[PDB]
Amino acid sequence: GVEIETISPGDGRTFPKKGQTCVVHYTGMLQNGKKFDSSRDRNKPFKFRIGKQEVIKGFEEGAAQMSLGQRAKLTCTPDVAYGATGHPGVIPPNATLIFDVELLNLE
């Protein structure tokens, strides 16, 4: 149940595919909560590829439904990332996650 809320500008055609390593200025946000993660702090904009199940399921589905330069807004359901378990100390069980995601990539 990933729902994409794209802020318009970009190109709308460079969609990510398999075997493509991409670069994202993400930002973690907790619904009814504060931030927990930001690529903008360390300023190393998180090079990662698509399909090797590295990232969570909600961020993986939202990455393929964006394009180059676009700025979407994720709303991650609990069942796709951690809502059964919860990452200990950082993510409580049954949490709904918010992400500001911009795709400024290669490949």
Domains of the chain and CATH, by start: 21-102 (3.10.50.40)
- In this structure, how many other beta carbons lie within 10 angstroms of the beta carbon of residue 38? 14
| Beta-bridge partners for 97 | 30, 76
| Phi-psi sector, 10: left (phi>0), alpha (psi -120 to 50), beta | left
How far apart, in whole angstroms, are the C-alpha atoms of residue 102 and residue 62? 11
Query: Of 20, 26, 18, nearest to 71 (Cα)?
Result: 26
Catalytic center residues? 26, 36-37, 56, 82, 99
Q: Is 35 helix (H, G, I), strand (E, B) or coil?
A: strand
Residues sharing a CB contact under 8 Å with residue 92, sequence separation 6 or more, in sequence order: 86
DSSP per-residue codes, 85-96:
T--TTTS-SS--
Tokens representing residue 9 in the block: 């500008």
